[PDB]
Amino acid sequence: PRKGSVPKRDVLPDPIHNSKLVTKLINKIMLDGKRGTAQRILYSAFDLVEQRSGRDALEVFEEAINNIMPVLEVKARRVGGSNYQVPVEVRPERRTTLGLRWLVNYARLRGEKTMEDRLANEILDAANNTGGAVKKREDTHKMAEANKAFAHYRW
Amino acid sequence: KVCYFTANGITHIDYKDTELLKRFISERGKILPRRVTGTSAKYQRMLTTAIKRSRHMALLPYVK
């Protein structure tokens, strides 16, 4: 906000895979404070993508996250009757927040039977550069590509 | 600073004296302000007249 910066609340490493990224994915799946389900959703999908791909569950997840994380965002400026869409490079911390969010949202929007299979399906598709999660960043990059003429309007 | 027209005693600036005038025309032939050259008000006027006479007679450039 106006006064300086806000310290962020940190997470502890995952119980199984020992990854702070994995625990934050649970924090996104969780609805109404229900940790139990969210913890079961991920482990029923991490162990599931191992049967589909074959490689390590955390190894595919790390590959997939890289293919969802955006490199260049588009923040909005204003001169008047024209709104300046100024492309801004994404800071590393926001990239993980956006990549995890796009994994969950574009897994919920799909459907086969349940959430665990949808999450597992989206995880493998992201590592293969397919799915809505990677199509969101491709549009995020595209808008940053088009508006390079507004680069020097970065406040 | 010193006028060079009062210091050296020049009481008649000649438009044929192109060399003397080239000290006040800068890089374009643009007449230099008297604050920059430090000539008095009395001699800034007869120097401007001499410069403009030289420009017409093609002894000094209008622009450069």
């Binding site: 001169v79 024209s82 390079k148 003429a149 507004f150 680069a151 020097h152 | -």
Partner: protein
Amino acid sequence: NIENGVAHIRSTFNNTIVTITDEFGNALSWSSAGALGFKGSKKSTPFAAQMASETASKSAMEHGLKTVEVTVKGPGPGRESAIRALQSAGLEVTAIRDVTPVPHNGCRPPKRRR
């Protein structure tokens, strides 16, 4: 030719017309910021001028241009980016002269806005 082809750059508050002609005033090619698909408020930007210059600069190399004189005519934002867009293409800029016309009066300037 071989070299010595002057480049005239017209940087205004709108697009920057960059044209590359020989030493004797014969146009080889030209490329304005508006010919690159740029919309308004994109036309007068340093980024647009960057592509505007080099787009005409590549067309010059086909006639074998190794020397350019940059004659800039206009007070526009896309001036300096245009000149560095010529060296980035390897055109060996020699001189930077400004030729923005200055009337010794003798014309009634169009009324200003309100």
